[PDB]
Design an enzyme around this catalytic site. Structure first.
Site, PDB file in Angstrom:
ATOM      1  CG  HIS A   1       8.741  46.828  25.924  1.00 39.55           C
ATOM      2  ND1 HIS A   1       8.259  45.666  26.466  1.00 39.55           N
ATOM      3  CD2 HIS A   1       8.324  47.875  26.776  1.00 39.55           C
ATOM      4  CE1 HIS A   1       7.525  45.970  27.621  1.00 39.55           C
ATOM      5  NE2 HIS A   1       7.605  47.321  27.826  1.00 39.55           N
TER       6      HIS A   1
ATOM      7  CB  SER B   1       7.138  40.899  20.231  1.00 41.56           C
ATOM      8  OG  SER B   1       7.106  39.492  20.163  1.00 41.56           O
TER       9      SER B   1
END
Length: 271
Positions: free
Chosen positions: A46, A114
């Site tokens: 994540h 990201s």
């Protein structure tokens, strides 16, 4: 009728179970696993502020893999040691520890959004013999305030980070927002660390080993511009690139089904 029940309902619905792994240091990585022991393993990483639940919806549609979805150290339910190195290399090495202990290290597929994309490059460049494919979803670390969170109604970083936010009950969002506010000292620290963590030079090892690479971007991504796909493709010329109209910075949340289907099409092409 409770927020914690809603969060667990989602996880269970995606066949995920939370476990804890104890690192070398004694620090804990909490992670979700679907326990599909028959599948090839996939590590999903994540982005900054996010956590393992950033993949909980998409995990439902990646049921053929043995999914390992961690809360990175610094984040989620994992330990949050204040003085630790949160650069991509350090983060990648702890993830190799977890995978090694589960016997899943030696042949592994890797994805990240990201920051988790910059960690995924770090990982691939450090363990090139083990990583069989790579999935970069609006990855950080390719350089071609308002990411940080002080109070409740800063949330509006939502509007900045997504074009097609999915409906989530306000109570669930509120638990997530408190978790960031509770961790904001460390979040400033980590942001400062990773703002500078550039992965362009390491990404050459991906090209050198010809690791298959899918690069995915939201065309409306206001956090890191879609023009970055030019730079990634330059550094990794074997990259397959997919841009997604009308989608922001988190395709695996905003466009769960297209994103899952685009990746599985890529994965099958490899066979």
């Amino acid at each position: 009728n409770t927020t914690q029940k809603i969060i667990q309902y989602e996880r269970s619905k995606s066949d995920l179970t939370t476990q804890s792994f104890t690192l070398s240091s004694g620090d804990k990585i909490v992670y979700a696993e679907n326990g599909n022991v028959a599948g090839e393993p996939l590590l999903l990483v994540h982005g900054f502020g996010g956590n393992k639940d950033n993949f909980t919806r998409i995990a439902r549609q990646l049921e053929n893999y043995n999914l390992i979805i961690p809360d990175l150290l610094g984040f989620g339910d994992s330990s949050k040691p204040m003085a630790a190195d949160y650069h991509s290399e350090a983060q990648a090495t702890r993830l190799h520890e977890l995978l090694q202990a589960k016997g899943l290290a030696s042949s592994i597929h890797v994805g990240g959004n990201s920051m988790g994309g910059a960690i995924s490059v770090a990982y691939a460049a450090k363990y090139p013999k083990e990583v069989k494919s790579l999935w970069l979803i609006d990855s950080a670390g390719f350089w071609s305030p308002l990411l940080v969170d002080k109070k409740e109604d800063f949330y509006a970083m939502y509007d900045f980070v997504m074009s097609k936010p999915p409906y989530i009950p306000k109570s669930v969002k509120a638990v997530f927002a408190q978790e960031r506010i509770a961790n904001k000292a460390l979040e400033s620290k980590i942001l400062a660390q990773i703002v500078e963590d550039n992965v362009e030079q390491r990404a050459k090892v991906i090209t050198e080993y010809n690791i298959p690479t899918l690069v995915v971007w939201g065309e409306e991504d206001k956090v890191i511009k879609p023009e970055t796909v030019t730079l990634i493709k330059e550094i990794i010329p074997q990259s397959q690139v997919i841009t997604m109209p009308k989608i922001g910075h988190v395709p695996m949340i905003e466009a769960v089904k297209d994103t899952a289907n685009d990746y599985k099409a890529f994965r099958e092409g490899l066979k």
